[PDB]
Amino acid sequence: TQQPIVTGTSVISMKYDNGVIIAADNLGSYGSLLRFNGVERLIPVGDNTVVGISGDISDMQHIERLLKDLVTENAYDNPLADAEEALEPSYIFEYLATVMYQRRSKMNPLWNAIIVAGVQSNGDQFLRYVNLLGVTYSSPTLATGFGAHMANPLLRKVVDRESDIPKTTVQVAEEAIVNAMRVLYYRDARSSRNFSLAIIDKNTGLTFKKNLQVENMKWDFAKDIKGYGTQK
Template sequence: MNQLHSFQAVPSTRNAFDAYSTLPEPPRPQSTHAPRAHTQQPIVTGTSVLGIKYEGGVMLAADNLASYGSLARFKDIQRLHPLGDNTCLAVAGDMSDFQYMTKLLDATLRADRSVSLTDTHPPFSPQNIYTYLSNLYYARRSKVNPLWNAILVGGWDKEKKESFLAYVDLLGTTYSAPTLATGIGAHIAQPLLREAYEAKAGVDGKGPLLTGQEAEELLDTCMKVLFYRDARSLNKYQIATISNDGVKISDSKSSETEWGFAEGLRGYGPQTQ
């Protein structure tokens, strides 16, 4: 007499076709919980930006170049970004992080404006935006995932009736001064800015400031010097003027340059003449 045997179903990850297959079962997928990786080196970058306080406001300058490594790849990039009515950013460093940061700030300002319709608090001042950026960049640095930028925040505080100029970088470093520059401009252009500023306002800064025309001519000179000396710069730049009347960003302009002297330059190797 045949005995009935009971079989207990065992759950399997193989389908019905695989049950009759003689091929080995494929390997199971590995865990997706790999270590998180962050950008460790910027790819498309912008070089130095400059800023100076003048009589009646602040001026910022930045060229229109975004370099792909050592290649002058994008020659029509605006690195001056207005925020609100009386604040403007001049941004150096990684362009993708620049885009992320400006979208975040624009969204924050839009949300603030919607709240202002039902509230009486004043809009963001340049100092508020500067504090926001300081906290943002320090927080990202603390997570070992920095935003690779150096930023100049220029603005006009309508309540205090005074100009504002400050610096923020990827480490969360912050400070304020009447003349500022980033990158190689801090070594080449900053001495020119500081010398012209102190020649009129004095070392203590209590004298009269540069006029708007003087400040613009000074920035033109500094941008020309940077074009001569900085291999990542471009002879096409814009100047932003921030005052009580608002933010005005100029059209792109170029400096008149002279390269005839290069024919007389000789390198450090053996000379043939």
């Protein structure tokens, strides 16, 4: 059957002219109760791809197993059958898709929502979305969970089409993910102040900045109004 048990928040992400950034907060909540903090939801597969997994934490672990098995299969046989048949993001993406789809038909699915973000070996930016249902779509900016229809609006104003990718840089995206995270921590009850951030660059590789706190926060407007409306 399967339904929400212990559930993560949102993975948010965007492209720029030389790569993509992808970030998520560290939470496995048991609904309102925030029962686990410090549980990382970005999972790197090789150094050209980070997969950000949302939804249920249980299923996440069990895809942690499948990504790790995958690296093993690729390494198998020749050592040269993984140097120029090395993994692309597009492979990881498709594999994850088809298992989810067929598991939904057995009626006990992997309850996840996933972003596969990476860069190809030709240098192309790769950001594409899959979910338990098996719906596939690409977008220049993508997010999952609550932040797919909350955080994502802001992000899409930076990049709305494929033409606005050359108008965005690694330091523009950098500011906007920090900002979309602050929006997330503010207006979502499921959130952690902690967040980890990975950047996949094609020029400089995987740079994995972990365990940032939300900064530039404001609460200076909470002294000015008290009561629920009627009370002055």
